[PDB]
UniProtKB/Swiss-Prot annotation, chain A:
This is DNA-directed RNA polymerase II subunit RPB1. It is found in: Nucleus; Cytoplasm; Chromosome. Belongs to the RNA polymerase beta' chain family. Component of the RNA polymerase II (Pol II) core complex consisting of 12 subunits: a ten-subunit catalytic core composed of POLR2A/RPB1, POLR2B/RPB2, POLR2C/RPB3, POLR2I/RPB9, POLR2J/RPB11, POLR2E/RPABC1, POLR2F/RPABC2, POLR2H/RPABC3, POLR2K/RPABC4 and POLR2L/RPABC5 and a mobile stalk composed of two subunits POLR2D/RPB4 and POLR2G/RPB7, protruding from the core and functioning primarily in transcription initiation. Part of Pol II(G) complex, in which Pol II core associates with an additional subunit POLR2M; unlike conventional Pol II, Pol II(G) functions as a transcriptional repressor.
UniProtKB/Swiss-Prot annotation, chain B:
One of its GO terms (cellular component) is nucleus. Belongs to the archaeal RpoM/eukaryotic RPA12/RPB9/RPC11 RNA polymerase family. A zinc finger (C4-type) spans 6-31. Coiled coil: none annotated. GO terms for biological process: maintenance of transcriptional fidelity during transcription elongation by RNA polymerase II; transcription by RNA polymerase II; transcription initiation at RNA polymerase II promoter; transcription-coupled nucleotide-excision repair. Its main location: nucleus. This is DNA-directed RNA polymerase II subunit RPB9. Keywords: Acetylation, DNA-directed RNA polymerase, Metal-binding, Nucleus, Transcription, Zinc, Zinc-finger. Component of the RNA polymerase II (Pol II) core complex consisting of 12 subunits: a ten-subunit catalytic core composed of POLR2A/RPB1, POLR2B/RPB2, POLR2C/RPB3, POLR2I/RPB9, POLR2J/RPB11, POLR2E/RPABC1, POLR2F/RPABC2, POLR2H/RPABC3, POLR2K/RPABC4 and POLR2L/RPABC5 and a mobile stalk composed of two subunits POLR2D/RPB4 and POLR2G/RPB7, protruding from the core and functioning primarily in transcription initiation. Part of Pol II(G) complex, in which Pol II core associates with an additional subunit POLR2M; unlike conventional Pol II, Pol II(G) functions as a transcriptional repressor. Zn(2+) 2 binds at residues 75, 78, 103, 108. GO terms for molecular function: DNA-directed RNA polymerase activity; nucleic acid binding; zinc ion binding. Signal peptide: none annotated.
Length: 48, 114
């Protein structure tokens, strides 16, 4: 009861602003993905 | 190795022993046709059996639109650049990822494996 009636003051939500990252993070993620795909390609070449 | 057939009944020739001249004779069970063989080996069993598919690869696979193509591997015979390639495409192969190549130039059909 106490926490609910206090939460009536602070509030809570979830949204796109909470699910969106920053440009630097997007660059990091894309770099990591490209490196991983390149490494998989290298492994396939060595196997062939 | 192979199967050889009698010329009279056209049945399989089983090996029969000639206990007089110490020689091998192929004889059938339908008529009394005899023969002398050149293999001199009744039975052969290889358990490795790592057959190179270059005998079993058809040259007609070059017309497949779903196969990858490369131009960094020119054909040994006709020097054509583009050459289809694929993997072993064999079941009962314990482990294999080697590539196989077929030249895409018509009537060349060169099938190698670097
Ligand atoms: Zn016969
Ligand atoms: Zn060729």
């Amino acid at each position: 009861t106490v926490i609910n009636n206090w939460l009536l003051i602070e509030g809570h939500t979830i949204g796109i602003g909470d699910s969106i990252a920053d440009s630097k993070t997007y660059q990091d993620i894309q770099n990591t993905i490209k490196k991983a795909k390149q490494d998989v390609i290298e492994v396939i070449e060595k196997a062939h | 190795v192979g199967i050889r057939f009698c010329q009279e009944c056209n049945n399989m020739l089983y090996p029969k022993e000639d206990k007089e001249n110490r020689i091998l004779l192929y004889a059938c069970r339908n008529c009394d046709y005899q023969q002398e063989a050149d293999n001199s080996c009744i039975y052969v069993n290889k358990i490795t059996h790592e057959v190179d598919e270059l005998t079993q690869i058809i040259a007609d696979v070059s017309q497949d639109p779903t196969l990858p193509r490369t131009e960094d591997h020119p054909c040994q015979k006709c020097g054509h650049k583009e050459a289809v390639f694929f993997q072993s495409h064999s079941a009962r192969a314990e482990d294999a990822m080697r590539l196989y190549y077929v030249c895409t130039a018509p009537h060349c059909g060169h099938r190698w494996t670097e």
